[PDB]
Each structure stands twice: as structure tokens, then as C-alpha cells.
């Protein structure tokens, strides 16, 4: 109905200066089960859904705290705000699912390369 500091989007994810690919590389090292779960889901999706999730997460991490917080608010007040969720509800599960994974990944994501797109290739 209303967003908290950590629901539906972790505070650390709304504040991180990292790219999606920095968070994903951090996850591959410090939250490997979460990374592999996400990539198993992702690889079962059609190419147009894969591309839509990459575009939308790049859009999210392009915003400052204000923009990210407004998106969190909009998805909390309306579970159907995000059109991508009509196709793939867990399109951002690696990024948004819980604050424990968020703390571990955002703690180290800055040390990884911002543009390493190989995090999107798995098997
Ligand atoms: Br929470
Ligand atoms: Br987009
Ligand atoms: Br913004
Ligand atoms: Br928005
Ligand atoms: Br799903
Ligand atoms: Br999620």
C-alpha cells in the first residue's frame, strides 16, 4: 500500500552509485546462489524479455535516489505499475528481493567494472 525504506526496493539499492553489472558481478562472488538462481530464470526467458529486463534495470540505475524512491513508491502503491511484471514478475529479483543480499552486494560492487556485460552470459 505504501513503501518502507527497504520494501519493495532495498535502501542500499536506492542509494548505490553502482551499475547493474557491478551489482551482478558482486553477486556472482558474495551471493552466488542468488546470482545463479537469477541467471537460471533469465536464460529461460525469450530474447525480447531478456532485453526488456536489461533496458529496465539500466533505466533504474540511471536515476538518482529521488527517481529510484519514486519508482519504489509507485510499485508499492500499485503492484501492476511495472509493465515488465505482466511478462516476468522476478525480472529484478537479484536487485530488489531482500535487504540482506542488497547489503552484501552494495558493500563491494564499486570495485568491479561498470560495463562488464559478460555478467549477462551464463552457461
Ligand atoms: Br524489508
Ligand atoms: Br526501459
Ligand atoms: Br532521478
Ligand atoms: Br516511476
Ligand atoms: Br517470475
Ligand atoms: Br523482486
Numbering used by the authors: 32 to 154
What did the authors write?
To acquire iron from the host, M. tuberculosis uses the siderophores called mycobactins and carboxymycobactins. In this study, we show that the mycobacterial core protein Rv0455c, a 14-kDa exported protein of previously unknown function, is required for siderophore secretion by M. tuberculosis. Similar quantities of Rv0455c protein are localized in the periplasm of M. tuberculosis and are secreted into the culture medium, but Rv0455c exerts its function in siderophore secretion in the periplasm. Rv0455c homologs are highly conserved in mycobacteria (>65% similarity) and are encoded by genes classified as mycobacterial core genes.
To circumvent these difficulties, we examined the close homolog MSMEG_3494 of M. smegmatis, which shares 66% similar amino acids with Rv0455c and has the same function. The three-dimensional structure of MSMEG_349433–153 was solved by X-ray crystallography and refined to 2.1 Å. To this end, the crystal was soaked with sodium bromide, and the phases were determined by multiwave anomalous dispersion (MAD) using the bromide ions as the source of anomalous scattering. The unit cell contained two molecules of MSMEG_349433–153 and 11 bromide ions with ~42% of the volume being occupied by solvent molecules. MSMEG_349433–153 adopts a novel structure consisting of a helical bundle with four single turn α-helices and five longer α-helices. A disulfide bond between C49 and C140 connects the N-terminus of helix 2 and the C-terminus of helix 8, establishing a cinch-like topology. These two cysteines are conserved across all members of the DUF5078 homology, indicating that the disulfide bond plays an important role in structure stabilization. In addition, we found that other evolutionarily conserved amino acids clustered predominantly in two distinct surface-exposed patches: the interface between the flexible N-terminus and helix 5 (patch 1), and the interfacial region of helices 2, 3, 7, and 8, (patch 2). Analysis of the electrostatic potential map of MSMEG_349433–153 revealed a highly electropositive surface for patch 2, which may form an interaction interface accommodating proteins or molecules with negatively charged domains or moieties. However, the lack of chemical shift perturbations by NMR spectroscopy indicated that the close Rv0455c homolog MSMEG_3494 does not interact with carboxymycobactin. This finding is consistent with the absence of a deep cleft in the crystal structure of MSMEG_3494 and in the identical structure of Rv0455c predicted by AlphaFold36.
